[PDB]
Structures are given as C-alpha cells and as structure tokens.
Amino acid sequence: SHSMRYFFTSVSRPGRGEPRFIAVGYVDDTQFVRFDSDAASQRMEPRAPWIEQEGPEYWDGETRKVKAHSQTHRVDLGTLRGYYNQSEAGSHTVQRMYGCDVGSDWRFLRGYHQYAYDGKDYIALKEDLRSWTAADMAAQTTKHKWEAAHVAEQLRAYLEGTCVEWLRRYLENGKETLQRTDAPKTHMTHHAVSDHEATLRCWALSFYPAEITLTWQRDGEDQTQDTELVETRPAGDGTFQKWAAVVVPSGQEQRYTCHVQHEGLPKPLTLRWE
Amino acid sequence: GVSQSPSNKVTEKGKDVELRCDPISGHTALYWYRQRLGQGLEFLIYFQGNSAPDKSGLPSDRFSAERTSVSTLTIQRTQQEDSAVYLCASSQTQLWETQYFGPGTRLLVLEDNVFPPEVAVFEPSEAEISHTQKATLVCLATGFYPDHVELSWWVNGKEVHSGVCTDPQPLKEQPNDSRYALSSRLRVSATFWQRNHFRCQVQFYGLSENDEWAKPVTQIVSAEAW
Amino acid sequence: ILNVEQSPQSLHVQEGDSTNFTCSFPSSNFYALHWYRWETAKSPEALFVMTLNGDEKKKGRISATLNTKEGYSYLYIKGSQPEDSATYLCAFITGNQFYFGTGTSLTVIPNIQNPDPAVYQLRDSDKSVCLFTDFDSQTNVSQSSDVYITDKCVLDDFKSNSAVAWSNKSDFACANAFNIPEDTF
C-alpha cells in the first residue's frame, strides 16, 4: 500500500573532483526531501510542504546521515573500480534504493534494499530480510562481507523498526498531500491525419497517485496494438499525466471509446467523442 | 596480530614524524586515535580501501594521512600539544565491526634535558628469606627522561612474566622539567636462589639514528643479581 | 554534536562482588555500540559490540545489555578478579563517526589469605630500599622532595602487595618509611 523510500546515486567525476552524489527521498509517489553533492546548502533540504515543520534537530539529524552515505559511496566506487580491474577515469555510477512499505492495517509488509553498479544489478536484499542475492562473483563476496558483518540484521531492525515508525509520522503529518486521492481530469481530442484516417486522443491529467490504467476500446475490443501508451509523466503540484491515442478511419470515430480506471474513481470512466 | 611502529618516539618543535600501522591480513578499514590524558579519547580519521571520505576530525593542517594494507600518518611541524598516545585499529571492511588494536605509539613534544636511566638491582633480607619461608628480588631504575622506558625481565636470556611486577606510573623526581624513576619487583622460591642470573634489563628509547647533538641512544642497560 | 556519558570513572570492588556500568547515549539514529577494556598501557580490547535492541551478549563472566529507545547500555562483570582491573569504554556509532563517553575505570582489591607484614630491608649491589609485603589491602600507602616510594603491585600461587621506598640523606628509610601499618615489621 503506502511506502516511504530513498533512492541513492553517486556519479564518479574523474580529473575534476568529488563524485557527484544525489540523494532523494520519496514517500508514496511524492518527493519530500533532497540532498545533492553539488547543492548550495550542503545539507538536506525539504521538498514537500508538510515536512518542513519537522524539528531543527531533525534536519541536522538527517543531514548527518546522508553525508555518511555519500562518504560510503565515495568509498564504494573506489572499492569497486579495483574489483573489476578498471581505470581511474571511467566515471561510473552506483545506485542504492532502500525503504519499507505498509498495509492498510498500517504495519510492516515489505522491506527493500537494493544495489546496482554502473547500471545493471549488483546485489539485492532478499525479502527474507536475512539473506542476499549476488548478481556477480564480485557481489557474492560483498554478500559474504555482509553475511558476516551481520548486515541483514541492522537493516531489518531499521525497516521493521524505525522506517515504519517514521513512515506513519510522515503520513499523519502530511495527511493533506499524501493521504489524498485526486481523481484524474479526463479529456479527449480528435486530430486528423487525412480524410482517409484520423487520430483519436485520450487525455488524463492532474492525477495522484501516478499508477493509472487507461485503456481504449473498439466496439468493446481492446485495440491493444494500434494504440500508443506513454510513460505516466509528472507535473506541477506533483501531479501526473498520461496520454493514449489510436488511428481511426474517418466517420467510424463514435465506435471508439476510452476507459480511465483509477483509485480516485469508484468505477472506470468511459470517455467518448462526443 | 597488529603492528604499529615506532614503539615510542621523542622529538622536537618543528620537525616531521612517520607513524606506521600495519593491520592484520585482510583488514580493509583503519582508525587513527590519539589520546590526551586527561582530556578523554576522541577520534581523528577513519580510512577505507584507499580513500579518506572524512577529514574534518583531526584538528589541523600539519596532520595528514596517507595509505600506502599498511599506512603511515604524517605531521610536519611537531608542536606543543601534539603530545599524545597515537593508536591504530582495524576491522574488516566495516565501521561498526569489531576493532582490534595496535600496540601503541607514545610521542612527546619538547626541545632540549634528556638522558638514559640508572639500573640498580637491590637484594633482599637476611631474615625475610627465612621468614616465610620467602625469597624476593627487587630492581630499581631512576635518573632518566623521558617516560618512554619499558622494562624487560630476563633470566637465562629467556623472559619471565610469572611473578614479576612493574609499577604502572613513573615517578617524577619533581614535581615541571624534573625527571623520572621506576621500580620493579620479583619473588622467587628460595632454594631457587642458591647459582643463576636474574636479569633486570630496561629499555630506554633515545635516538640511535642520530638526530641533533651524553649520547644518548636506544640502549638496554642492566643490573645483575646473584 | 550529540552527548555520551558513562558512570562513573571509579569502582573499587572486593574481588567477590559483581559490578555494573552505565553507558548512556541518545535514543535517536542509533546504529551500533561498542564496549572497550583498557589495561594500564597495553592493547585496548573489543569486548562486546552491540547491534540491536534488545540484545544480551556475554563472554565468560563479563556480560552486557542494550536498550535503544531508552538511552542506555549496562555492562556487568561477574566474580570480579584482579585480572579484570582496567578502564571500560562504550562507543556510539551513527553516521560514519564515533562518540566515546568519558571513560569508566575498574580496580579490584586483591584479597589474600595469611597476611604477614614484614618490611624487608632495602638492597645492596651499598645502597638502600625500604618497603612492605602482604599488607592487604585498604591499608593505603600515600606520601610526601627527596623521599621516594611507589604504590604498589601484586603478584602471581599467592599474591603479594608491595610498596618500595628509598631515599639518601640522613633520615634513612625504615623508621623514616613512616609517611597505616601495625603489627608488622
């Protein structure tokens, strides 16, 4: 259901200094914090209105750890670039994502911690919260490092523990932005390519969260394939959009429909023209 | 085990020092500590791999670390307060992981007196050796400066740690430039004392690669009992 | 900066008792905790390292407890011994840096059977040493610019506490060894 999650990325920068490191934190589908190796602040700036009221001890607290991260990333890149027998001027990436999610009962359901180097997978925490998966042999030892540093444990106790403990703290405080459901704004446009053919266009704007399914029927059949679907994309207010369209022989328009189903709508919305 | 040399070192205002620490095989993390008594302990720099992610803990610029497995620590411009025990520890990989500690390296600022010790071995009582029946053996080393004197007990050339005793704190003769004094004992059975050689040998750390210049150099000096 | 405290520096137990120290540390943003032992001058040793709430690890006769939300970590010693006598350190690790609470140091009091307080001599190789043996053990030696002693140290089947004393001028050192003792010489 709901979840609070941190994505981490540090990009190596050769011959021009410290690897850039971007840390950004999400709860549900919105963005509430940020840290940047090239930030003016050199500290953790709030990105969502509801979290700014958090204590002066908080931002100091958080900042302190996110630094520790970029330290460790500045470490990771290095202590990977020698595992893989690679140059100094390669400018590689390391990615870490971690976080916990909760049910409608609002308690621990899932824990994720995952880690990939220079793109494809490297190591990921099994959902066991007691074991690991090694994509490479290089990983399999990092596994064996953590397997002995008892690393599974600390993270587990964090995720089952204070990750959740704070996730509710966030939600209850950001009741306004997080717990809402703003049903999508539905629109439809016709744009011709010829007299021979035409292009019907299905618009869904201003919706939160972003997970939306909008489909498109001919007489009841899902014209699966002549249709084009585009990655659900963001906007201001931190709201989302998606767009789907097809070719429609002229005049046979009113045959075509559009179904926009979403958590904000009790039952799917049938969009027509018109 | 861990290795960390020089065991001790004494030098003066405005010169360099190289502090070695060799972690155990396969260690990957290293910590540098200094302790000013009686300030308490606080932490200076941690190293991982070959990289120093944090600096802003060791106090000033003269301090700077290099990692060369083994690594060194350099402070140019040895000055007044940089006068503490410098400790080095290693945990595999990982910060929270169990640290294992080096021997230790003392270091004292100053410019200047410095001299090696007396070693005089006393011998026990007419009647005490028959009182217990008990036997006993004493040692005593004074007139030296500065502290970096560690005791070695020898007998037949092979060391003994069974009954020996060294005092923990040195004895300032007074009270702030005055020099030191120490006293180690021993007890041995009495039939044992009838024609062997019980060595109270004492290590003073001077300078045996000559520095500016009654010598006085790394020496062992020893008083013997029968 | 966030604070750490231990309590207190100074414990003196009778070698039969048990003992507990009190390392405070914050609630928030905990990750790890460390307990260290520091005899005199020699290797400080990692004893336990505490990871999670609420664990209870023990080695031999040394034991320890972690509590996270309530900021504390107790450490118990069982069946105190001479060997134990050291200084104990708790460390607090969060965000890739360490925070040591002001040390807490342990000294036990070696109990001995059959005490015979004979103050033996001095030495020759012709100079002087004046001292005491046995003498256990809250009979505490404490002195005076040229009258020299040391206090004290303990041995090996039996243990002996002995405090050497020496001087030079005039006063000699045995009736002068008076600074306590009775029923001794």
Binding site: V66, H69, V75, T79, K145, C163 | - | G95
Partner: peptide, 9 residues
C-alpha cells in the same frame, strides 16, 4: 529518517 548508516562493498 534515513537509515543511520549503511555498509559499503
């Protein structure tokens, strides 16, 4: 609240 501290490889 980020995890107080992570590991490395």
């Amino acid at each position: 609240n980020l995890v107080p501290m992570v590991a490395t490889v």
